[PDB]
A paper describes a structure:
Six of these [name] domain-containing proteins also contain domains with E3 ubiquitin ligase activity. Here, we present novel crystal structures of the [name], TRIP12, and DTX1 [name] domains in complex with PAR building blocks and their analogs, thus enabling a comprehensive analysis of the PAR binding site structural diversity.
Based on the high binding affinity of the [name] [name] domain to 2’F-ATP (15 µM, ~2.5-fold higher than for ADPr), we solved the co-crystal structure with 2’F-ATP revealing a different binding mode compared to ADPr. The ligand mainly interacts with a network of water molecules and a hydrogen bond of a ribose oxygen to Gln1667, as well as π-π interactions with the conserved Trp1619 aromatic sidechain. Overall, the binding mode of the phthalimide scaffold overlays with the adenine-backbone of the natural substrate-derived ADPr and the 2’F-ATP (2) molecule, suggesting competitive behavior.
Author numbering:
A (entry chain A), B (entry chain B), D (entry chain C): 1615 to 1689
C (entry chain D): 1616 to 1689
Write the structure that this text describes.
């Protein structure tokens, strides 16, 4: 649950499924500039150079974020 | 120019003014959970626990992000 | 992505692929520390102080986590 | 005070003075590859491309680190 996408309808950041988070995070860690994934009948590209997810069918843009863990870690 | 808010009308992340970026970043660094700033008389609150900016005149919620620079630096 | 500083050489040093994966798996899991071995020596990484501890001698060497830029560059 | 330097004598990361932290952090945020500061009777260079600080009088090297705050912030 390290990646999130923003929902403008509700005004909240939302989690991805475990499998879609893994697909996104694997591409992030591999140095890719973008990644494609599917959810049901929906098709998306996450653009890491802009931190935006684009619906491939409609062009709708949803912002994305990467959660960050504190360094150093707290006790 | 390290903080950004997402403009849903244009579909792009946007920088704050130098003054507003400083107000936000100083609150971030001091451990505050939120911060108020203005653009002229227009009032906003950034909520750091949700990474959302609340327009205190329209109520619209826009996501925010903190840009992160690479560690170590290149070159 | 994890590095330890070698004061003998004056440089940050990478871990082996397996030790990097062990450390990073504990980091991502939210643990406060992680055990590994290097060269028949036992070590603990303490994430709350960002140091590696030699379990035999007590010697502390600093560690660091490299960070990727957000957003990514084109 | 977000920057730290490692003290091998005590085995701990240590904070900078407010002013020296500010000098370092301003160069960091400005995109510079290194920065010099003076503390006491010594000049030091922080090399951001290696995350190492060099004492320019003696040549002694100490590792540095940049603390990171959690995103999003906890309540
Ligand atoms: N309630 C909702 N309203 C509108 N749109 C939604 C949505 N809930 C998810 N979406 C869209 O869907 C993407 C993947 O969201 P995600 O949770 O990974 O989707 P699924 O559970 O179907 O995953 P999977 O079964 O592995 O394909 C997400 O960015 C968002 F764009
Ligand atoms: N106790 C100590 N032992 C060994 N070395 C030390 C040290 N204390 C500071 N150093 C050296 O000096 C640098 C700046 O350390 P810093 O605290 O910003 O400098 P000042 O002393 O001017 O601070 P202040 O007393 O608060 O005004 C620091 O990286 C390190 F290299
Ligand atoms: Cl949006
Ligand atoms: Cl969509
Ligand atoms: Cl020194
Ligand atoms: Na040295």
């Amino acid at each position: 649950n390290n990646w999130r996408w923003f929902d403008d309808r509700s005004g909240r950041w939302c989690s991805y499924s475990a499998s879609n988070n893994s697909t996104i995070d694997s591409a992030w860690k591999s140095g890719e500039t973008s990644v494609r994934f599917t959810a049901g009948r929906r098709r998306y590209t996450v653009q890491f150079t802009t931190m935006v997810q684009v619906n491939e069918e409609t062009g709708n843009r949803r912002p994305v974020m990467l959660t960050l863990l504190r360094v150093p870690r707290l006790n």
